[PDB]
């Protein structure tokens, strides 16, 4: 009842209202589910559960996990569930899949995330519209980017963490520009060629966001969330809104043995942490401290880190708190350069981690989410 990763794939990540606009989160979920099954070397008939992270579910139909599963030729007998833990959604999906295996209920599952922020709608409230009209509510704002407890944007919340660490505009901007550099370098060298599956639309084969940097504009931008003169977070050093999906097939040790399989990684452990909503940016290091403690490891044991870059400060805070070598963190770039399709990013950083690790190396992927939580997973590359 050990947990192995058989496959780990992702779409390229597209910009908002760009190349993937005509494809739904269901469509993208089918792309990565089908390809993850193909690369797992198991038939779709062997997949027992489909677990899908998705945040902006409005307008997509009943339980998109079931739509994806059926369209991916997974048996009607297999169980399908869609889950929402904001940015952590598809990391939670992977953790749920691991748990199902750990407890002996399942042998083989597919865990993924998919998000089409391009197709998030606007809301008209139920019940008659009063004299004077009403605001059309943006799903992206209300259900995606605004903290619902503090009733302010996650980027305004993150400014608190900026101040708490005495970070500067200069550091946030340098971090962002370096995320773009690493992403550009990775694409130039073909470093994403093991993990990216092309999406027919005529075909998207490369991430879009990293090409959009206008360097000379970065110091000219005005703070986007805090405008009292002390602001630091801008459109350039915050992640963007994006479309994409990512998937892993998980299988038990028994399946691996019986099938003579060659899994690509092993899930060793996971941890979850929670803090005040406003402080969500520092939850990942808390989850990692728990992860390493329970695993009898320390930071130096870990070859590579993925910390999802909700904002540049997310990366900086993580690196500073855990006293990491920055050169071992997000080595192929992170979401500030690659984009952040909310429901997909949890699985997306696990996919990137798996394929950056060399054999026998340990990696940690960690992600925060609006509301004050974070999830982390420890993996060993085989």
């Amino acid at each position: 009842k050990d947990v192995y990763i058989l496959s780990a794939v992702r779409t390229p990540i597209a910009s908002f209202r760009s190349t993937l606009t005509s494809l739904s989160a269901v469509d993208l979920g089918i792309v990565v589910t089908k390809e993850a099954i193909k690369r797992s070397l198991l038939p779709s008939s062997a997949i027992e559960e489909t677990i899908v992270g998705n945040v902006l579910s409005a307008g997509l139909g009943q339980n998109i996990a079931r739509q994806i599963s059926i369209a991916s030729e997974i048996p009607k007998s297999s169980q399908c569930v869609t889950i929402n833990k904001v940015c952590s959604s598809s990391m939670k999906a992977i953790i749920m899949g691991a748990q199902a295996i750990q407890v002996g209920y399942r042998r083989i599952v597919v865990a993924l995330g998919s998000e089409s922020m391009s197709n998030a709608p606007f809301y008209v409230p139920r019940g008659e519209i009063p004299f004077g009209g009403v605001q059309l509510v943006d799903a992206l704002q209300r259900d995606g980017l605004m903290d619902s407890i503090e009733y302010q944007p996650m980027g305004l919340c993150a400014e608190k963490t900026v101040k708490d660490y005495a970070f500067t505009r200069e550091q946030l901007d340098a971090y962002a520009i370096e995320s773009y550099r690493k992403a550009e370098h990775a694409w130039k060298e073909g470093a994403f060629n093991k993990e990216v599956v092309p999406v027919s639309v005529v075909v998207l084969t490369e991430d879009e966001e990293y090409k959009r940097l206008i360097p000379e504009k970065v110091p000219a931008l005005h703070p986007a969330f805090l405008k009292d003169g002390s602001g630091t977070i801008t459109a350039a050093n915050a992640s963007t809104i994006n479309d994409g999906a990512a998937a892993c097939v998980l299988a038990s040790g028994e399946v691996v043995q019986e099938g003579r399989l060659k899994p690509i990684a092993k899930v060793l452990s996971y941890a979850e942490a929670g803090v005040e909503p406003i402080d969500f940016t520092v939850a990942p290091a808390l989850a990692v401290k728990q992860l390493l403690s329970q695993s009898g490891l320390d930071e130096e044991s870990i070859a590579l880190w993925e910390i999802n870059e909700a904002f540049s400060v997310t990366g900086l805070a993580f690196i500073k708190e855990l006293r990491l070598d920055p050169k071992r963190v997000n080595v192929r770039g992170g979401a500030v350069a690659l984009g952040h399709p909310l429901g997909a990013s949890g699985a997306r950083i696990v996919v990137t981690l798996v394929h950056a690790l060399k054999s026998d190396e340990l990696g940690v992927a960690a992600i925060c989410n609006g509301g004050g939580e974070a999830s982390a997973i420890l993996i060993k590359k085989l």
Copy 2:
């Protein structure tokens, strides 16, 4: 790592655009979470996870499970997730909570469901509106009541099951009227007084739907889903749209022992089944066959049954397939009379089952969902 139910409570179920309109799914979720914690006799500080079923999540904010948890004074360190398995959502929530305990990850969790169908919005699509305009999409239809694979209403799908069993309008209507009779009788005798928690708005203390039956109108209604002359399902013998919530606190055997607690029930087993989307109505008996097989039980072992009444045919098919005594099924009425707040109904039928069972009796609660799946749980009353 046995799984006990410490508490099981629900709101009254309100009609569409009625007494609970001013309360959100978050508000209702807080009501039942707070009261479930109170009746568990554990402090809110002991709750380790909050797992919430919800289908129509549009406009409600980030991850309503986290909103509910925080507003219920559960620690910021506790983990919160919202899940969508259409009508099965909060049965899945309970199963997830049981699994977390089974695997030794958690000791104490709260599992619930909440749905405010009154506040489900309409959708305007992203991107510019073409010449000629566009349809405003109803969340209730698109994300709640329409099967997304067959692209037709669940009630049209259920007509297939009607034909497959050779059920008649006469049987469907008699079943419906009897669900209302049992609900009315239960409320007259106070049978829901252990489980219902009143909701301040001036206060809702009783289910609303069961009072709305107009008997003489039932045979006069025209089929609502199939109009070719062979239709049988009507507004009266189908469940309605509704607002409500239901919650259980679950705890491990270790917690019970250490705390000298008196749990009210034990979760013995669960099962999940899946079939073709159009055949969703017959999935519950399939789940129960699995449940009983793996538990070494047969149908006669079971004192009481709850089968969620998506439609009258749901109950009839279940009873016929499993050859049950109808007098042991939904003894206090079912959703055709009580209402069907989608995300809440899974937990709601577990709550009703728990409090109808007498000590040492075994009960089964089963629920189907759009897309072709069903979930079932076996419980022992203590």
Copy 3:
């Protein structure tokens, strides 16, 4: 080329979202056009032009005057135009009809107004909706009740006139309550029985608004437009939003002679005035001063007055400025009690004036409109 009124009829005036909701402005316009033609004793084939006042034209189709004309069996060869002078619209319609006759172009026309404020829609702007959404604009506000030059409600503007005359809450409220008294008395005594035509929907036969007064509530209301403590205008002493229509058939002296007709009144003269938008409330007395001057008359020559009661202050200011006997003004009540369907009110007060006048008496009807204008007409009852 003298101008005679052959007929003058109106619908009852219905409250907002009340009995006439299912009828469009076109439907109501057809009712009064058909009945005005009937009572003119001329065939519909003789009507040469149809001139219709209407303010909230959104969603009603092309040129509602043509829709009304065709559906009223007026020849396809007859000319149809819809005009907007806000509250003055159908007084302008009558003036246009008189001018067409005066200049010898036409012999016979129908001039009317129709407004269904119940069916005024909300607006979604053209072009893609930005991040964060957009306000749904209320047609009633934007195109009806807000002054577009001052960008504030007409009721806020009218507070300036209140201050300029040193009027008091006490006077405004007493005026309002008296408008209701006169309307109630008129309906009790059958005084509207010559002019009102019933509207089949099962039938509306009486004005609705005047029955809605709650006397004891009037001094308890808070100012609706000005909230700095100096406000005086409230929901009770302002006119309401309403549905209704009114129509007159006009004919030349030549037609009357050739047809041996018995016209009910003669149009002697008209005048139009304009002032600053904020001062629109005092434009009617300015128009009347011009009207009387050019006609060689003085105020004492005039038996009865109709001053459209946009607000109670409209009536008070008019009476004070012209030094009128209040008992000769709006003797059957005015729009504060009867309602104010914007596009219809100009013709509606001419209809009420015509039928309150006794033979050989002179009457003046005057009406202000948002933007700072007013229209007045002098008539002689035959």
Copy 4:
């Protein structure tokens, strides 16, 4: 009480959602009103009335004629009215201005039309949205381009006229391509330089639509309105939707004499006709027959014609019915090439006619409108 044209100006006509999108119909109306006043050589204080044609008035505020008048520094005492006769609206405006002068009521008026089809909104109906949602109605369709009596597009109606004259796709397309040729030639030679006033936005100085012809695509297009195989009208041989405005200052003979003015043209006569809505395309020749009859003229008396090109068939039918020399008709191109801002086109073709005529020449401008009417005016160039 003769009627003279002192000035006649227009904006360039912009394409839908193009260069003038940021300008409202009020903004464009102010541009042409101010410039018409400037070129009339009278001060704005002398303008006694402002009469404005406009069809799609939704969202624009109260009585746009008053907004335009005030913003153009015309006295608050001057009278302002907005009128809707669909495509004929601003020809009707000019006729109303002429009548006001003819009857001796006014000496000096400005008559214009303005339309911003780019800013026509969508409509949400009043009252609560039913289960299943509702269609968002396009103002352009419902209030502009659909005949409201036949409940079909004006282009489908026009196919009847195509059949009645045995016109062919080949003739309609050749006519369209020639309208574009004449427009292109006119702009190349500077023929619109007397009438066009540039619009600051950085500035629009030339009509946009005529540049958009793709010749080789014209025979490839499918009929847009009638798809049973007998259709002939396409996007290329129908007019387009557009933004623009046009204005004339009119003055009496007395004003001209007293002011020592040099008017540019004289309005000799006007006529109006009406037919069945479906037959609206043949109303213009009917109006012209009346115009010429009452004026003691015949077709050969007329140097130049403007027939508004709602469709290519509009021009062809007019030319055929009146047996005109095509080389004297729309000599600088017509609306199929220049665009058709509905409320503006009536005045726009009068402006183009005035400035194409040489001194002492007679011209006729004629325009049809949805609903079955047409207006025509006879002018003499001075």
